[PDB]
Amino acid sequence: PNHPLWYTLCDRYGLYVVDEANIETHGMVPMNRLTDDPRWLPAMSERVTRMVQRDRNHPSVIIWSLGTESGHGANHDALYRWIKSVDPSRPVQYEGGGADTTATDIICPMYARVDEDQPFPAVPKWSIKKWLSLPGETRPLILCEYAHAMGNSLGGFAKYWQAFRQYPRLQGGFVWDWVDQSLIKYDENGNPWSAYGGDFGDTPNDRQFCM
Amino acid sequence: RLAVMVLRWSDGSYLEDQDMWRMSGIFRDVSLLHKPTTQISDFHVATRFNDDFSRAVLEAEVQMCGELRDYLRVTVSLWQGETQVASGTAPFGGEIIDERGGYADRVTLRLNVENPKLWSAEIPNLYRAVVELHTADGTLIEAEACDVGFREVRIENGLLLLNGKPLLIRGVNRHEHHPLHGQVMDEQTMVQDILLMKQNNFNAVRCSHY
Ligand SMILES: O=C1O[C@H](CO)[C@H](O)[C@H](O)[C@H]1O
Ligand SMILES: [Mg+2]
Numbered sequence: 097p098n099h100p101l102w103y104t105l106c107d108r109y110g111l112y113v114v115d116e117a118n119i120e121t122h123g124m125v126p127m128n129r130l131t132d133d134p135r136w137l138p139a140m141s142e143r144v145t146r147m148v149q150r151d152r153n154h155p156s157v158i159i160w161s162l163g164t165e166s167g168h169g170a171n172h173d174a175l176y177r178w179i180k181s182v183d184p185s186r187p188v189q190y191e192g193g194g195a196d197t198t199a200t201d202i203i204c205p206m207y208a209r210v211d212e213d214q215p216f217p218a219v220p221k222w223s224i225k226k227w228l229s230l231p232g233e234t235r236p237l238i239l240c241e242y243a244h245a246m247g248n249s250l251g252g253f254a255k256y257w258q259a260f261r262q263y264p265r266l267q268g269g270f271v272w273d274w275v276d277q278s279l280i281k282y283d284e285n286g287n288p289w290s291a292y293g294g295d296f297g298d299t300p301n302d303r304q305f306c307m
Numbered sequence: 308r309l310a311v312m313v314l315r316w317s318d319g320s321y322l323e324d325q326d327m328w329r330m331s332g333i334f335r336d337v338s339l340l341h342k343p344t345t346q347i348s349d350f351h352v353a354t355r356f357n358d359d360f361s362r363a364v365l366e367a368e369v370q371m372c373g374e375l376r377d378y379l380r381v382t383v384s385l386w387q388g389e390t391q392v393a394s395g396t397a398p399f400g401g402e403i404i405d406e407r408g409g410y411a412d413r414v415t416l417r418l419n420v421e422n423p424k425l426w427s428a429e430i431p432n433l434y435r436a437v438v439e440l441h442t443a444d445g446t447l448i449e450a451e452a453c454d455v456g457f458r459e460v461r462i463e464n465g466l467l468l469l470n471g472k473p474l475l476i477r478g479v480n481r482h483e484h485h486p487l488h489g490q491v492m493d494e495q496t497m498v499q500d501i502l503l504m505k506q507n508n509f510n511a512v513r514c515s516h517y
């Protein structure tokens with residue numbers, strides 16, 4: 097959840113907002129180790145329920161998100177249902193566990209390609225065009241992350257938009273991401289420069305991957 | 308002496324606007340068939356399966372024409388080669404279907420078949436069904452028969468399934484055409500087509516358009 101003024105500004109200037117619970121357990125092995133554990137359900141529930149209680153009156157918020165990169169655990173299913181019951185006015189989405197679990201109203205993959213399948217075991221990223229018409233599938237598809245804009249990038253961006261326009265149930269996506277997470281440091285003359293991972297003696301680090 | 312007056316055009320022609328040569332005549336086989344007075348007038352074969360296809364029930368509905376009699380029986384027997392695999396016998400008289408009773412001129416036979424050999428375009432396993440109309444003590448009136456392929460065709464979850472597996476149709480449309488004989492078909496031409504189709508990795512054909 098963002099600084100509270102963010103939603104006020106989105107209401108007034110007009111942007112659709114996905115409001116997301118502060119839950120990410122990416123470094124766990126497997127990714128759902130905590131989110132499938134009922135011991136972590138109280139802590140996860142507060143991150144979801146207190147967000148909803150705070151932001152549910154903002155018209156700019158159109159979709160709730162259960163967080164990101166935490167696999168798919170039973171706790172997600174419980175909290176998905178909690179939101180559906182408490183606030184029927186907004187769809188709930190969540191990408192973890194393969195982007196199309198029972199904890200999401202929207203197929204919301206990250207970096208699934210337009211035409212090319214990436215058939216990873218357990219959590220494949222299907223071509224978005226293919227994903228829509230998998231046997232029994234009926235939901236809309238909106239990429240929660242796509243077109244990773246790292247450095248000299250966004251090659252193939254037009255390919256996404258041709259597909260978005262051609263396919264009714266491909267209803268777009270959210271580019272990753274808006275702003276470089278670089279930090280300012282200064283040389284001996286006081287000239288500022290842009291720093292990334294490792295530049296503060298932080299180790300281990302992931303270098304330029306923050307930008 | 309038979310006299311047959313064949314018309315090239317009829318009101319039937321309005322329903323026969325296929326993109327093909329427009330021809331006419333007696334272009335398929337003519338035959339004479341002798342049936343007894345008491346006869347098999349229709350029969351339907353169905354095959355249903357359990358979830359993993361390890362058991363089948365062959366269901367055979369048989370209709371008669373002629374005089375109804377208590378001594379009448381139908382036997383449907385199923386053969387794999389020279390081996391009889393299953394058999395059923397019953398008098399005529401179907402189950403009650405409405406307030407007026409049932410079909411006294413019909414009978415349904417049900418045969419259990421364990422581990423049926425399944426039919427597909429890959430392995431065309433066939434059994435032989437023989438439908439015998441006979442008296443209670445086994446005097447045959449007549450027999451009809453067909454080839455039986457044990458297979459289930461169904462659409463589930465948006466997929467066409469044959470024997471529980473999603474098909475991939477390598478199909479072609481095939482008109483009945485011969486450069487010399489026109490729209491007359493013979494066995495040799497038909498066999499030649501099937502061979503060429505299979506040799507070129509086709510598994511399916513559409514009877515375009517009749
Ligand atoms: O759509 C069609 O196109 C073909 C054109 O050769 C042919 O006319 C077929 O009978 C018709 O079904
Ligand atoms: Mg036509």
Ligand code: NA
Nearest residue numbers: 260263264266
């Ligand atoms: Na669309």
Ligand code: NA
Nearest residue numbers: 304305306307
């Ligand atoms: Na990053």
